């Protein structure tokens, strides 16, 4: 049933996409672990537990930032099922309208979401971390 | 056993960073999945199997890059198990010093490791996500 897990898993990113780009917490909530433990590492801080995620990265860091969102992955995810768990990661981009000058921004980056079987509710997101691109020049990125 | 295995997983870490700091991946691959699903992502790249692990983060990135390096954490890590799997968190530094021009480098940041049981092994890493610290002017980190 490892595919049947991948297939889950993947169909869960896409659906975590338009949570996204819709900045709505009530339904990434289906998608994560509402628990103190799930958190989200990202490049302007730490998310601890369900509701620092739901208030400031999907209300504050997606919803108040910008007025339009579009999340989309480079190719399929990698994921890699050890029994109840499984690591998820890909490759995104990111284009939204800023709310404070109007102004389209556009990043990258790379992404890792941890997914665990949650009992009687199915698989979730335990963590995430995402970053920017890669960065090879001499002396950066360590 | 939970407790247990936070030990293990704790300790493990500790040893992860002596294998950084001596740039050894025959000591990497003692705490390490010894597989081509092992992953690492990193600002310079993303490590897809042990193999890569081994030899461009190890050897290359670590290894060949510096002379002496020193990598502690901030605090102790965060560890949420979830049966056979664990999600580690911590916040790091690290004090380099570059063989191309024998300057000190330091950096820090925020990593991840997701930690499997592997059958008749034991608890090993499936997974590593490290980036920088955060940054929260405006208009960056996304």
């Known amino acids: 049933a490892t595919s049947t897990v991948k297939q889950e898993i993947t169909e869960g990113i896409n659906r975590y996409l338009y ?3 819709k900045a709505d917490p ?3 909530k289906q998608l ?3 628990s103190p433990e799930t958190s989200f590492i990202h490049p302007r801080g730490h998310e601890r537990g ?3 995620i739901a208030e400031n990265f999907y209300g504050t860091t997606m919803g108040k ?3 339009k969102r579009t999340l989309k992955l480079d190719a399929p995810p990698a994921i ?3 029994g109840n768990a499984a690591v998820a990661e890909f490759d995104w981009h990111f284009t939204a309208v800023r709310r404070d000058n109007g102004q389209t921004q556009h990043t990258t980056g790379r992404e890792s979401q941890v997914w665990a079987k949650i ?4 698989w979730r997101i335990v963590h995430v971390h995402y970053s920017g691109p890669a960065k090879t020049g001499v002396g950066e990125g360590y």
Do not use: E, K, R
């Open 19 to 21: 949570s996204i780009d």
């Open 65 to 67: 930032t910008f007025s």
């Open 119 to 122: 009992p009687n509710t199915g």
């Open 50 to 52: 369900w509701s620092q």
């Open 80 to 82: 890699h099922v050890y």
């Open 32 to 34: 994560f672990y509402v």
């Open 26 to 28: 009530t339904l990434g």
